């Protein structure tokens, strides 16, 4: 019978989610809340809030630190 | 429009060398955050202009103000070539930042098998185990490659005889 009704894939792990399961859209690209990982904190970001800068993604907090004084 | 800084990354590798020839040696100023020209250059990808800089006297064992060694940024860029000559200068892979992130952790975080090999090709050991075991083996066992897993485990891990010499030998 076969099956594999996969569709839509992580924009970072390339996984394939059923996307009302655990897929996260940010801007228009899909990321697993597993792809929601701080490059410093790339442990998954709590409550899922993330901010992307210069090819690396940091919670805003760290992003400002690289992007601005402290 | 960051003047020379913006025009420099315009790919005009000639424009960055142009101001880098400061006959007064001052324009070699980093940024308010302490970002060094080498730092920005490391992620740019113009191996030429940066290569010469490293020869001027800039050391690779430098930590950005946020705490980030060029080794990380280098692999976090994706330029196989720069990595080889950048990681073969001092091999400071055995020198992580403050979180412990090893160049390999980042190398696989993006997807660079080749460079990842040259890293453990020294002894970094791919089975290091970050702070919670967050090592490429897991990030590689997720996609389900199995290709680099066998090559990784075929180095000395899958066929591991029962270790001993530390339980029943004395008391
Ligand atoms: Zn994913
Ligand atoms: Zn963060």
Token pair for residue B147? Answer: 């290709």
- Residue B62's Cβ-side half-sphere holds a number of Cα atoms within 13 Å equal to 20
Check residue B11 and report its DSSP letter: T
Distance from residue A39's CA to the centre of ligand 2 (Å): 7
The CA-atom distances, in angstroms, between B144 and each of A10, A17, B122, B140, B155 are 15, 15, 26, 6, 19
B142 chain-A contacts, CB cut-off 8 A: 13, 15
How far is residue B9's CA from residue B40's CA, in Å, rounded to a whole number?
9
Task: Name the closest residue on chain A to residue B97, using Cα atoms.
Answer: A40
List Cβ neighbours of A48 (8 Å cut-off, separation of 6 or more).
A24, A33, A36
CATH of domain A1-70: 2.10.110.10
Name the nearest CA neighbour of B102 among B113, B89, B112, B116: B116
| Total Cβ atoms within 10 A of residue A15 | 19
Token pair for residue B171? Answer: 């008391």
Which alpha helices (DSSP H) does B9-159 contain, by range? 13-20, 37-44, 47-56, 70-77, 80-87, 103-110, 113-120, 136-141, 147-153
| Total Cβ atoms within 10 A of residue B39 | 23
Check residue A4 and report its DSSP letter: -
| Total Cβ atoms within 10 A of residue B140 | 19
Name the nearest CA neighbour of A40 among B30, B98, B46: B98
List Cβ neighbours of A62 (8 Å cut-off, separation of 6 or more).
A38, A40, A41, B66
Backbone phi and psi for residue B70, each to the nearest 5 degrees, phi listed first: -55, -30
For chain B, what is the domain count?
1
Of B32, B76, B142, the CB nearest to A56: B76
Query: Ion ligand 2 — residues with CB under 5 Å?
Result: A 38, 41, 58-59, 62
DSSP bridge partners of A27: A29
Name the nearest CA neighbour of B158 among B169, B168, B146: B146
Answer yes or no: are the C-beta atoms of A54 and A42 closer than 8 Å. Answer: no
Q: What is the dihedral of CA B71, A64, B45, B17, to 10 degrees?
A: -110
B109 chain-A contacts, CB cut-off 8 A: 39, 42
How far is residue B18's CA from residue B7's CA, in Å, rounded to a whole number?
11
The minimum CA-CA distance between B162 and chain A, rounded to whole Å, is 33
3-state SS class at B102: coil
Domain range for B4: 1-171
| β pairing state of A51-53 and A29-31 | unpaired
CA angle B42/B67/B52 to nearest 5° reads: 25
How far is residue B108's CA from residue B114's CA, in Å, rounded to a whole number?
10
| CATH assignment at residue B32 | 1.25.40.20
């Amino acid at each position: 019978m076969a099956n594999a009704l996969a569709s839509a894939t992580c924009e970072r792990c390339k996984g394939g989610f059923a996307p009302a399961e655990k897929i996260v859209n940010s801007n228009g690209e899909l990321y697993h809340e597993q792809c929601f990982v701080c490059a410093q904190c790339f442990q998954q970001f709590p409550e899922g809030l993330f901010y992307e800068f210069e090819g690396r993604k940091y919670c805003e907090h760290d992003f400002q630190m690289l992007f601005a004084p402290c | 429009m960051d003047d020379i800084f913006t025009q420099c990354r315009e790919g005009n590798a000639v424009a960055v060398r142009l101001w880098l020839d400061n006959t007064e040696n001052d324009l070699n100023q980093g940024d308010d955050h302490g970002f060094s020209p080498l730092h920005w250059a490391c992620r740019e990808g113009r191996s030429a202009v940066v290569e010469m800089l490293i020869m001027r006297g800039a050391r690779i064992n430098v930590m950005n103000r946020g705490d980030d060694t060029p080794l990380h940024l280098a692999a976090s860029h994706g330029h196989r070539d720069i990595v080889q000559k950048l990681l073969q200068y001092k091999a400071d892979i055995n020198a992580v930042n403050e979180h412990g992130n090893v160049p390999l952790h980042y190398a696989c975080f993006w997807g660079q098998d080749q460079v990842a090999e040259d890293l453990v090709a020294n002894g970094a050991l791919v089975s290091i185990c970050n702070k919670y075991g967050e090592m490429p083996v897991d990030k590689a066992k997720a996609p389900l490659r199995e290709l680099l897993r066998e090559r990784a485990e075929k180095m000395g891990q899958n066929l591991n005889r029962i270790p001993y010499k530390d339980t029943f030998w004395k008391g």
